[PDB]
């Protein structure tokens, strides 16, 4: 059974066992100067931004963006599972310009990205909404260990004992990294509030100037209501053994503030006290 195993340490970070097993392929990954890397802590808007980028690259052409599932159009680089998928292989075989997905902490990113000085789009999301999204994702996406109860999972999340390690260090170190490499550092909440503004930021970062009409096409097709029902974007093409949407759909709620529905008041107060200690020295600021 490739599913439901315990995580394995890779350079200090808990990762899926099969990523650890095939780490050589990941560490030696060959980037290209025109790769665009989408980098996120899990559940922070990866799919949303991936779809936006593929829409941009296809001039808003919805049919072209249905050429394959999002996880084939924008490969999850480090995800290697025996008999199931190999993100590195998928990317090696992909023509430029490539859009690459990762969740690796900064210190684990393949060094080729730095050597090629790639542009990177990092997406962050408020921690409370992330842990809620991640709890349900752990339940449905069977590569993860069992999450246990919400209480148990929340404690694991606070302790960084989850796939890809602690949220706190992930977002903080990627934020610091923006001084060394070209990183457009976006917030899920900003995309919720004014998606047009955020897509315009992406376009500027990519040095692309497009007609208003194309921008509006991209906006329309990247909305939650459209993506939720789009089988090329909503992960329903995944084998049921890998993702069981009857447990929880991938496109779950797509809002900011679902944390209020999940956290008890006591859990919230405890989480905030812990958060302040971990985050007060970083210049990073979030809305919940
Ligand atoms: N177009 C969109 N607009 C808003 N949220 C979206 C979205 N597409 C996906 N999401 C949300 O992004 C989260 C998945 O993130 P990732 O792609 O990084 O795994 C899920 O959050 P919820 O579980 O809070 O609904 C999902 O519903």
UniProtKB/Swiss-Prot annotation:
Induction: Up-regulated in liver and kidney by dexamethasone, a glucocorticoid analog. Its EC number is 2.8.2.-. Its main location: cytoplasm. Gene3D superfamilies: P-loop containing nucleotide triphosphate hydrolases. Keywords: Catecholamine metabolism, Cytoplasm, Lipid metabolism, Transferase. It comes from Mus musculus. Sulfotransferase with broad substrate specificity that utilizes 3'-phospho-5'-adenylyl sulfate (PAPS) as sulfonate donor to catalyze the sulfate conjugation of catecholamines, such as dopamine, prostaglandins, leukotriene E4, drugs and xenobiotic compounds. Has sulfotransferase activity towards p-nitrophenol, 2-naphthylamine and minoxidil (in vitro). Sulfonation increases the water solubility of most compounds, and therefore their renal excretion, but it can also result in bioactivation to form active metabolites. It is found in: Cytoplasm. GO terms for cellular component: cytoplasm. This is Sulfotransferase 1 family member D1. Substrate binds at residues 76, 101-103, 137. Belongs to the sulfotransferase 1 family. Disulfide bonds: none annotated. 3'-phosphoadenylyl sulfate binds at residues 43-48, 125, 133, 188, 222-227, 252-254. The active site is at 103 (proton acceptor). GO terms for biological process: catecholamine metabolic process; lipid metabolic process; sulfate assimilation; sulfation.
């Amino acid at each position: 059974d490739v599913f439901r195993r315990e995580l394995v340490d890779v350079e200090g970070i808990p990762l899926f066992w099969s990523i650890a097993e095939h780490w050589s392929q990941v560490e030696s990954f060959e980037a290209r100067p025109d790769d665009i890397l989408i980098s996120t802590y899990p559940k922070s808007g990866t799919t949303w931004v991936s779809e936006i980028l593929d829409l941009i690259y296809n001039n808003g052409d919805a049919e072209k963006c249905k050429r394959d599932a999002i996880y084939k159009r924008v490969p999850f680089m480090e995800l290697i599972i025996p008999g199931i998928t190999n993100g590195v292989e998928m990317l090696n075989n992909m023509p430029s310009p490539r859009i690459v997905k990762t969740h690796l902490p900064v210190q684990l990113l393949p060094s080729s990205f730095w050597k090629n000085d790639c542009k990177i789009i990092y997406v962050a999301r408020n921690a409370k909404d992330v842990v809620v999204s991640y709890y349900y994702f752990y339940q449905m996406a069977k590569i993860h260990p069992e999450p246990g109860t919400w209480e148990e999972f929340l404690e694991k999340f606070m302790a960084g004992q989850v796939s890809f390690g602690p949220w706190y260090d992930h977002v903080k170190s990627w934020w610091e990294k923006r001084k060394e490499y070209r990183i457009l550092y976006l917030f899920y909440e900003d995309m919720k509030e004014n998606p047009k503004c955020e897509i315009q930021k992406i376009l500027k970062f990519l040095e692309k100037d497009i007609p208003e009409e194309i921008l509006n096409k991209i906006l329309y097709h990247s909305s939650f209501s459209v993506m939720k029902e789009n089988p090329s974007a909503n992960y329903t093409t995944m084998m049921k053994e890998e993702m069981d949407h009857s447990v929880s759909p991938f496109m779950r709620k797509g809002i900011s503030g679902d944390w209020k529905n999940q956290f008890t008041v006591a859990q919230y107060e405890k989480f905030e006290e812990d958060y302040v200690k971990k985050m007060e020295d970083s210049t990073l600021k979030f809305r919940s």
